[PDB]
Amino acid sequence: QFTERALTILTLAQKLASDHQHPQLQPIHILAAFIETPEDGSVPYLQNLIEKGRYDYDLFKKVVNRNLVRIPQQQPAPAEITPSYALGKVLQDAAKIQKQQKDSFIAQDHILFALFNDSSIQQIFKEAQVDIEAIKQQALELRGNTRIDSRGADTNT
What we know:
Protein name: Heat shock protein 104
Oligomer: monomer
Helix content: 55-70%
Family: Belongs to the ClpA/ClpB family.
Strand content: under 5%
Subcellular location: Cytoplasm; Nucleus
Order of helices and strands: HEHHHEHHHH
Shape: globular
Strand order of the largest sheet: 1-2
Distance between the termini: 21 Å
């Protein structure tokens, strides 16, 4: 039910939590995964949105990364990294947004749209001086009338 790229982001999100000894997986981890460099050698999806929206991407990354690495480490590192409640709702929202867009798979677009409904994410965008509604408009423009009907459909470009 997830696209390849959506899946990459969720996996990347898990690695990020792990690499920093964070106890729970949270929305910030997904946001933080959006700004990793793709192995793709390509421009990240969210970077395109931010720059076409004409915000400062460098300042944006600093703000996001600073919110990630200031999450306090837990040792005893739990056997698992639990998805928190906020993240559960975010994923649950992404599937609803997928259906409203009449798409067949949950894409990185849907996850990004779902992240916007979460309060911590909103607080982060406000710290980075980025208007969420503007990014939402860029996201629609990015996608045009493209149907997300394959797991490869949600291109970064």
